[PDB]
Amino acid sequence: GERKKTVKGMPCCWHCEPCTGYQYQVDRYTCKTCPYDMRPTENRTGCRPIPIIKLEWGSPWAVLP
């Protein structure tokens, strides 16, 4: 769940830094950027649907109506 370990001139030892928040560790060397249709979960690998909210009957801004 943490990509972009960039290899130096020698292809043996790498430095690992976090990718972007909206990006993924889908592959070892690819940040996937899962689309806006669904939000990253706790682990940065694998997409997860966004929770949905609606007009709640107990909404504080729906008392006077």
Ligand X SMILES: CC(C)CCC[C@@H](C)[C@H]1CC[C@H]2[C@@H]3CC=C4C[C@@H](O)CC[C@]4(C)[C@H]3CC[C@]12C
Binding site residues, ligand X, CB under 6 A: 60-61, 63-64
Rounded to 5 degrees, what are φ and ψ at 62? -125, 30
E strands present in the chain? 5-7, 14-16, 38-40, 47-49
Q: Which is nearer to ligand X, 57 or 61 (CB)?
A: 61
* Closest approach of ligand X to the CB of residue 58, in Å: 11
Q: Smaller CB distance to ligand X: residue 42 or 56?
A: 56
Rounded to 5 degrees, what are φ and ψ at 61?
-90, 15
Nearer Cβ to ligand X (35/65): 65
